[PDB]
Amino acid sequence: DKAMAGNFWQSSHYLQWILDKQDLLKERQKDLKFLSEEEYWKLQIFFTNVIQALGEHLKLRQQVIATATVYFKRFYARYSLKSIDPVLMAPTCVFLASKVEEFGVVSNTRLIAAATSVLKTRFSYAFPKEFPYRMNHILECEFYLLELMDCCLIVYHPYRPLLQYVQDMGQEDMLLPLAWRIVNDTYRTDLCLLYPPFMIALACLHVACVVQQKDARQWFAELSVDMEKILEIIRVILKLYEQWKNFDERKEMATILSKMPKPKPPP
Amino acid sequence: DKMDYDFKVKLSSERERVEDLFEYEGCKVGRGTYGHVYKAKRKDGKDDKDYALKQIEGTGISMSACREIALLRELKHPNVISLQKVFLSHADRKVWLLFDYAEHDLWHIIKFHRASKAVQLPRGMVKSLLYQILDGIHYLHANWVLHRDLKPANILVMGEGPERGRVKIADMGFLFNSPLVTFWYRAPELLLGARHYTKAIDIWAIGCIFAELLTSEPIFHCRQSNPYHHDQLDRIFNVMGFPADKDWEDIKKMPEHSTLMKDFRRNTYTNCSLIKYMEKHKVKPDSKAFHLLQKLLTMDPIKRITSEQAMQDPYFLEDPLPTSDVFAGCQIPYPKREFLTE
């Protein structure tokens, strides 16, 4: 029973941050001069995992993590990886998301300790040196994040619709756990910038149904939804896992992070 | 230092500073816990309109400011105040907000009548004011957004302009939704130690305001840390009467109930009822107004009516019907906002 729970069609998410794929690719050309298309999605997957592991350390519910991941996606959707260090942007997004969702102001010392500890423990393969930023950087970077997003803080995720579909299906025991992970996995892709969250929900449920061999064609057929757009999301989710299979993160990412464009310093 | 330089300088060059867009020097209309509020006018732009420009207190993006920005950005309804633009002053790290300026509010309007020669609030104006207050709060509640501090000073009315006499609910501030000197608009469950705000708590405040519009004085007026406040409850009971077992069955479930029984005796308020209070301020107890007021001022929160149902009350189908312009095209006697300096 969260705030703004059924306002999506007049919301800032829908009326601004559901982007055109052409425009998304066009601004991405600026970072594609250094990194290949393959190396760019491999970078998306990595910072999705960094933001995840920052959430699990700070003891944060999946929804507050999901927003942090979206903020991050929105920023670099419109700007280069040189603009602000994504190692700084990640903990700023988690810090900012926690304030918005009313989970307390995650403490300064605890926020810095989280980033420091996660990068040393679970990400040493990519980051050999310590987390170099102190809290006054997080506070500065926050001001840029809130500015780019046009102060759009409320963000709608697929989980709430997924619940409503699995309840309606009458199969919450079998499907909801697997469906919920596929929804988590959609954040490795662009899908949340390109399609509305209920459609992302519907795709994950369909893949959940296919994996578990649960026939649901009739149930899906009864929806008044554009199924071609659902098949688009399924194809991305199906690709996502083939990307997963062939992507060894821990061997590759150290090299990819050096290829990222460098921020130009003051003269 | 570690960011891209071209990126910093571009945004620095392109960022709209507040100082440069608006003339507010020596036009401070309000100063409170919220921060600083000015009556501004656009400098460069060919805009003749008046703006309320608020500087939020404290450096940075506080919990209190973050949610305020969050909700206001999504919220869009005629009777709730619309956020035009947010300015983020990077140097001092202050946050400014820009609203369409509301000249008047119920606090200042009520104060104007209460002052008097020794001219009470016109009845059609009150109905229109009430209807609009219930229209906005219903929009907030439909979106699972609670006010948590409805009072006359937060119910703004617009001055001479396109939106003449339109109500505008202001103030979207407020730890786990848990509240643990003026408690006149506070519901009794909060006084008896309710651990969470509800839609019902706001509806009580609307009744207290509606009461105040009719009588020109606060229904639960009382002298001045913990949730339990004796003298406020004493005032509520002296007006409303002490709640019988059948009126509020789950009062026993309140944390301060055992404290209430120690300190209060129900026999003391046997000659007390809302019918009697309102009668003493020349309000007929068999009037559609009174009956709505009573439904709004139900002691038991689960027996208090929703804003949805309040708008549906036949009070609003009785002559005079509520108007969009609360003044109904009548010359506005209420004085304008006096300026400040600090």
Ligand SMILES: Cn1ncc2cc(-c3cnc(N)c(Cl)c3N3CCC4(CCNC4=O)CC3)ccc21
């Ligand atoms: C001295 N005094 N007393 C009430 C009051 C209200 C305003 C005011 C005028 N126009 C508009 N458009 C807004 Cl939004 C206003 N405010 C109402 C919300 C406030 C207060 C609480 N928290 C807030 O943010 C700011 C002032 C200005 C001076 C006033």
